[PDB]
Design a protein around this nucleic acid. Structure first.
Ligand SMILES: [Zn+2]
Ligand SMILES: [Zn+2]
Ligand SMILES: [Zn+2]
Ligand SMILES: [Zn+2]
Lengths: 78, 78
DNA sequence: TCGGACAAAATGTTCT
DNA sequence: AAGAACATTTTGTCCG
């Protein structure tokens, strides 16, 4: 299937969302680093397999908007 | 006479013909030496500043060329 | 699914 | 100034 963030091949539902392993780990690192990324464009960068490295701000924004959340399994269990 | 012409960080000298910081110097060398088949995720006018210069190597390399960076600056100069 | 360990890629600094 | 070595950061895969 397809990662909902970067369109690469997805490796499961991570943190609530069908995503590839690279996006899974990017997301956990972003949340736990509480990094404050800034876009160099217009907050609408193309995030695909090549370009996902280019804008961590837009990649992270796509993660969050797709509904990724570290407590996804904890919420869904409930 | 103080600022990197590519990213606006503090320049360290006049490298490959242009006033630049050390990071832009070696970024340009690596880009020319090798391949630079970079892809912009924006509209080819990414802002290249001290933080964001890492986001888009395509626009960073474009700004190096536009500023006139070239490997044989010192030969050409002589 | 999740995350630790390891590895690769990409970037940046020292040069006593 | 330019470049090799060294070093760090950022990203991605392998395992369990
Ligand atoms: Zn992805
Ligand atoms: Zn962006
Ligand atoms: Zn610079
Ligand atoms: Zn760009």
């Amino acid at each position: 299937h397809m990662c909902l963030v970067c369109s690469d091949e997805a490796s499961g539902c991570h943190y609530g969302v069908l995503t590839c392993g690279s996006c899974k780990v990017f997301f956990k690192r972003a949340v736990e680093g509480q990094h404050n990324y800034l876009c160099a464009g217009r907050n609408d960068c193309i995030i695909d397999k090549i370009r996902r490295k280019n804008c961590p701000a837009c990649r992270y924004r796509k993660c969050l908007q797709a509904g990724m959340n570290l407590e996804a399994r904890k919420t869904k269990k409930k």
